[PDB]
């Protein structure tokens, strides 16, 4: 069920952002490898904004990493 691909462009640090969906419904959980702990929670209705959160960001492939991370990580983790 939970199986996305990553959220990155190019490659440096290893700069790469998993994310998750439930069965049910959409779910968007920005998960980094550089530090090794994922620091990102986010739950979403329709899969329509899932992509578009992640497209329209001021950020430009790595860039959208700290940015999207920053965002989808506002919340406390589990």
């Known amino acids: 069920m939970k199986f996305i691909k990553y959220l990155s462009t190019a490659h440096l640090n290893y700069m790469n952002i998993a994310v998750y969906e439930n069965g049910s419904k959409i779910k968007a959980r ?17 899969t329509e904004q899932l992509e578009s959160w992640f497209y329209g960001l001021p950020g430009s492939g790595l860039g959208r990493i700290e940015n999207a991370m920053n965002e989808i990580s506002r919340r406390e983790n589990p």
């Open 30 to 46: 920005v998960e980094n490898v550089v530090n090794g702990k994922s620091v990102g929670a986010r739950d979403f209705d329709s």
